[PDB]
Design a binder for this molecule. Sequence first.
Ligand SMILES: Cc1cc(/N=N/c2ccccc2C(=O)O)cc(C)c1O
Ligand SMILES: Cc1cc(/N=N/c2ccccc2C(=O)O)cc(C)c1O
Ligand SMILES: Cc1cc(/N=N/c2ccccc2C(=O)O)cc(C)c1O
Ligand SMILES: Cc1cc(/N=N/c2ccccc2C(=O)O)cc(C)c1O
Lengths: 118, 121, 121, 118
Amino acid sequence: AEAGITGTWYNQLGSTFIVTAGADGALTGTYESAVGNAESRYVLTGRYDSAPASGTALGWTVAWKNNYRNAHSATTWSGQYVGGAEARINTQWLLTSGTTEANAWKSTLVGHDTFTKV
Amino acid sequence: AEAGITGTWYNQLGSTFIVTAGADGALTGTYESAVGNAESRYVLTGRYDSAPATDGSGTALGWTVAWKNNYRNAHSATTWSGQYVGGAEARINTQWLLTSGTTEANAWKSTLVGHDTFTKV
Amino acid sequence: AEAGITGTWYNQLGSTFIVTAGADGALTGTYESAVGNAESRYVLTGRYDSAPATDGSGTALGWTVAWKNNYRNAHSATTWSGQYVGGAEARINTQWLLTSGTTEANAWKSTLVGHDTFTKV
Amino acid sequence: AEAGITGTWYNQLGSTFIVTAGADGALTGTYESAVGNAESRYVLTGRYDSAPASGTALGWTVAWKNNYRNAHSATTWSGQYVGGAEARINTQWLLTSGTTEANAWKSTLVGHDTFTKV
Ligand SMILES: Cc1cc(/N=N/c2ccccc2C(=O)O)cc(C)c1O
Ligand SMILES: Cc1cc(/N=N/c2ccccc2C(=O)O)cc(C)c1O
Ligand SMILES: Cc1cc(/N=N/c2ccccc2C(=O)O)cc(C)c1O
Ligand SMILES: Cc1cc(/N=N/c2ccccc2C(=O)O)cc(C)c1O
């Protein structure tokens, strides 16, 4: 479980997610993105169901600001962890950019990522 | 921001979001839901842009809540993604995704999508 | 429905949606956008539940617009999915997805998501 | 192009989509779903960019009512057609169910389907 989630994971774009699942339902770690106006690692934080039944529900957020670059945007991934000998985290994500009120209608992208555990 | 964002907010359904914005970009607090398989408060954690642009744009942010506390566990989690817009009548406009843990056969229908507007009233 | 749904509607941005609801479930009409790379009217086509439940529920519906007319082509399309709720002050509440045609390298960022509320005013 | 889109396609769940792309940007056809409260074929209608640049943008809708069953819901797929010797239509979809006003918050599911051409 906790053992299940904690580790290094990669998505289909070549991005890397390193996470630790705490006994209280916390997720903490770092994210390194292959795409966008990003470079180096960014802090992530999230939550997971620490007493799952079925996959395990979880979610996390990254604000794309570090000591090197600021894209003025944040992404949230919502999904579930599924274990076995082909462990995966399947998600859908929302990326919101800070915009003026007149451009807010086009502030949010949606997509999906699948993570494989190393 | 932190300043602006820190406080007690309410959405249109009447749920309450109590948050603290750290100088560094962390969001921490509690969420109390008006709907769904929930009772009492739940922990939330998130991140926000601690150095927004100076051209008039909103501040990007996001947070998550897993729906498990000492009273009940819905085996699900919601993530909110959006922007804080300050001023006389500040608001946080968001879109959200709620994923439930399902078997493989029901994975196609695991996630709901919606939108919430939070104010200080 | 058809009756209820047929008419001229406006969203919060001021775009205009002129629709006809057929007895059989078809939606046909024109859309004029207040924002984006668009000018004039565009054709839309959709479907709706022509025999909704009688328990007080809304009527499910959806429609699409490709953004190409005789004046301009944005190489994109939006789909709206939602429900019509009748009454004294009828509304259509929707969520939408706008996909642009992109190269393979930019496919990850091809689709925007949002929400629109349409009224008769 | 038009030739490109018109045909029979299947998704990862085993559902079938039969569509004809008209010269005016119309899409018409039928959909047979492998999942949900559905049976037999349903009418679909949509639109596509008839003069694409990059993939070709398109979208379509199905209301899940036919002469045999009514689920009181509709799905819209938004995506793009990409040709080659491995032709595909990649989409994201929204499924909305008719609900009472008190349950409207949970009326809409979101997902993604990839279609392969037969
Ligand atoms: C605006 C902005 C967007 C961005 N997209 N990230 C992602 C978004 C969706 C799916 C995967 C990733 C991924 O990184 O795997 C990354 C940075 C750094 C940024 O500033
Ligand atoms: C699956 C599930 C969903 C749920 N909905 N909450 C929300 C979801 C999206 C937006 C707002 C709320 C809101 O409450 O403001 C609450 C519980 C307890 C639960 O188990
Ligand atoms: C890519 C692109 C987007 C666009 N946004 N329209 C909308 C999109 C979503 C919801 C409402 C509207 C609305 O207008 O009500 C308009 C054009 C012409 C275009 O090329
Ligand atoms: C409520 C309801 C839902 C439904 N899901 N369809 C889909 C939804 C998302 C992705 C693919 C399909 C697919 O069919 O490939 C199908 C019917 C018939 C229905 O009544």
